[PDB]
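User: Okay, second chain of the day. Same drill as before: sequence in, structure tokens out.
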Amino acid sequence: MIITVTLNMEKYNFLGISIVGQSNERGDGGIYIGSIMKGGAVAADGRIEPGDMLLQVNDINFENMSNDDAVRVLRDIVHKPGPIVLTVAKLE
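Assistant: Same drill. Structure tokens below.
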């Protein structure tokens, strides 16, 4: 199941997630939601859970990217004006 969420940044301010992991060199796996902080935009939306794989934010793809780089990119994205649209693969 893939779910794409448009976050309400105007109301909730900050993403409020932690992320764990990264894709292997072959391209399997990716970056997962480790935790979701109460009071942030991701918590507000309600549909994303811990263990979901973070696939894309706006036009930026999170497979085949280091966790270091992902943390940096997520900061950069949230600081830019405009919508934040997050797509995840749901953990079974």
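The two ends are 8 Å apart (CA to CA).

User: Thanks, on to the next one.
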